[model samples]
Target: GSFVEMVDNLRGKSGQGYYVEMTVGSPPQTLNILVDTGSSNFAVGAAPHPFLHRYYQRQLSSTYRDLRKGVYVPYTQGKWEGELGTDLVSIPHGPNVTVRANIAAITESDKFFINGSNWEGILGLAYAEIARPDDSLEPFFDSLVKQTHVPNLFSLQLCGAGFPLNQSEVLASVGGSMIIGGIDHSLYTGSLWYTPIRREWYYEVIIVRVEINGQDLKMDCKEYNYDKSIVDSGTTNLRLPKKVFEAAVKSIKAASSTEKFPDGFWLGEQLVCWQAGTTPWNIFPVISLYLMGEVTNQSFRITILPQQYLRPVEDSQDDCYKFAISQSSTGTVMGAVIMEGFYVVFDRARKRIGFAVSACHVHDEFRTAAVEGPFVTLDMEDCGYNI
Candidate 1:
């Protein structure tokens, strides 16, 4: 029998990312670390930075061992330069399985962490294929599975979103859960809909369609899978490719209210505000995405309400909202904005990601995230193949 560790989870001081407290080293040093599925490298701050309160102190840890290898990882948001090392990693609030693991002790970073944040490092959960320099290094989750010999799957239920730095102290107080070895059925409802994993690098998927207001986008299915889409916890918004973004904006505006939105709002540079008590949720269109299933040509659709795509400004005295759907240069990123609505399972053992309607998304008995369908289609081509 496997034991589940109960982690007291919290969103980052940025108010968007989800993380858990963990004790590292022999005597155990605690830090808040980000649970990221976008990249590989269990890198932590080894040097001083104004953004973080503390870092990995190699001098203080009795189990620290240096590998003497230079390391660099370029994330979409930031990059870090570090040294490859090893230390006894103990997840005090997780699997309760301690393992001698690879650690990237960062000496410096570029925009990797913003000021007023709480996370001291990142625990990359993607497969080793995307590990820095080469695939020789093992990722955090990869090694965890080998040690515990638990199920080669994990699930996440991220219930919070981001806010401006000014109110991070008061606004960043949301919580969620993580299941390491198995599924927690009580966290979600309905049958889980799974999307086949096309690659091991990221939780990559094949998107078959895009729908606004339960209606089709009338574009080629390839448009949704342009350059290969991925389900990532590291990303904040529901990112759309260049062409998909433009079409989505056009459709959304036509489907609902057509008031001229702030130019910066669409570019993710500004927030749109209304009166203190009014909500813009009713005026926005519902959004959905269809991902190709493990079975050939079958698809599973996940629908999101306006509340999931429009983020409320926490500090504003007025009812300010930010567009949680943004454009991505490298295809769509099914990020936290969407994941917050579903219980996402990273089932690497079976090469699929499963999404079930999470109870956390319920309010007064209404859930914004709805999962449906094993819809059959006729796109004979392997939608997720190549790149």
Candidate 2:
């Protein structure tokens, strides 16, 4: 009934990405797959050449067989097109639990993200609506539901930069984990706040109101429509509507007396460089989000810490804020940049998402055991009962 997986960042602090470690095929060829909550299509090998790569070796596995169906799934950056097939996927639980679930695999692809990468493919965690139509297979989590022994839920305790790091050991230890079946209390503190899922496709939720430094900002229909936002693990940065975006920037500028950079080049359209001491967490106003259906009148707020927001721009001496807010016509996004400080729970059956303060900064006793491929670990003793 217990299962765990150590999900690590794809690269080091410089890389700033995360992925899951899973074994595919009959004999079990392990591969690191990106954990994407925004889409649902499990695939591998978009590498340009027919190389004998460690990613996906269809010939090596005796159980491998192509379904002979061609698929083309597109993304903001590129697309993944390949033949589909079923494979035996194994995720390590405990020594006694070895669960093999039937999973869909893309034997080939043609995209920039998958070519010559350290990781193999994508593990889509969202609902079925975003999956490919031709052979849109059931999600891995849905497959888990059919099995009575395993818990239907999973938790992600994303690691922060609180731990000491070296260049060599950075990638392995910096990222936290994706725990299948249950929650880990050691990774988080206090009670979890829950909200109902607005839509089945994405982990979308309704926001009652959004505030900057305790002042509520007006939400214009043109700038910020649809009172909703998605909790996407796949998205690296936060994207807000135009009105919200402008208001937030205005608030930050009014609150601080920091001077802008020479040309005022912002990183990721969300971060702008400023004099270091001018933008500490205390100086900046905390962002409060009021989710619908909460019993308490309190709002969930996050203080943008100086260590989190201020980072050195690559190849430059300028230190820029790492905020991910942008003016997008599409729905709002609660991206990975801000989600790192919280222990997130995706309750599929209950149609709810939960959040708690991540204990990454407070807990030092936790240890991650080595299992073969890339992984991170956490102690289960402190993981209190799921709320």
Candidate number with greatest TM-score: 1
Per-residue lDDT tens digits for candidate 1, residues 30-106, read 98788888888898998999888899999999999999999977767778999998888876666758888899998
Question: Taking the tens digit of each residue's C-alpha lDDT, what string does model 2 give over 297-335?
Answer: 333333333333333232233335544455555667776
Worst 10 residues of 2 by lDDT: 368-377
Q: Given candidate 1, what's the lDDT at residue 189?
A: 84
The alpha-carbon lDDT assigned to residue 125 of candidate 2 equals 81
Model 1, global lDDT: 0.78
TM-score of 2: 0.77
Q: What RMSD value applies to candidate 1?
A: 2.5
**TM-score of every model?**
0.93, 0.77
RMSD of 2: 9.1
lDDT of each: 0.78, 0.56
